[PDB]
C-alpha cells in the first residue's frame with residue numbers, strides 16, 4: 236500500500252513539519268512525499284536508517300516516492316529545515332531493531348523533542 240505525507244511550513248506541531256510524522260509501513264509499501272508548501276525535500280539521515288537500506292535525497296519541491304524494503308526504523312529530514320525540527324520517523328515491520336539507537340543518537344534539541352513526541356504521542 237501507499238501512504239501519503241505532506242511537507243508544510245506550519246502544521247499541528249508548529250513550523251516546518253511532515254504530516255504525518257510517524258509512518259507505519261511494511262516492506263514493499265510506498266511512501267509518497269508531497270511538498271504542499273515550497274522549499275522542502277526529504278533526505279535519509281546518516282546512521283539513522285536500517286543496515287542494508289540505501290540512502291536517499293529528493294529534489295526540492297518535487298513529489299517523491301520512496302519504496303521501503305528493509306525492516307527497521309528510518310529517520311528522515313527536510314535538508315533545509317532539519318535544525319528547525321522537520322523530521323519524520325518511518326517504522327517498517329514490527330519492533331524495529333534500531334529504534335532505541337535512533338532515539339539515543341546525537342541530534343538537535345528541537346529534533347529530539349519532536350521525535351520523542353511522535354514516538355509517544357503518535358505511535
Ligand SMILES: [Cu+2]
Nearest residue numbers: 274275313316
Ligand atoms: Cu523543509
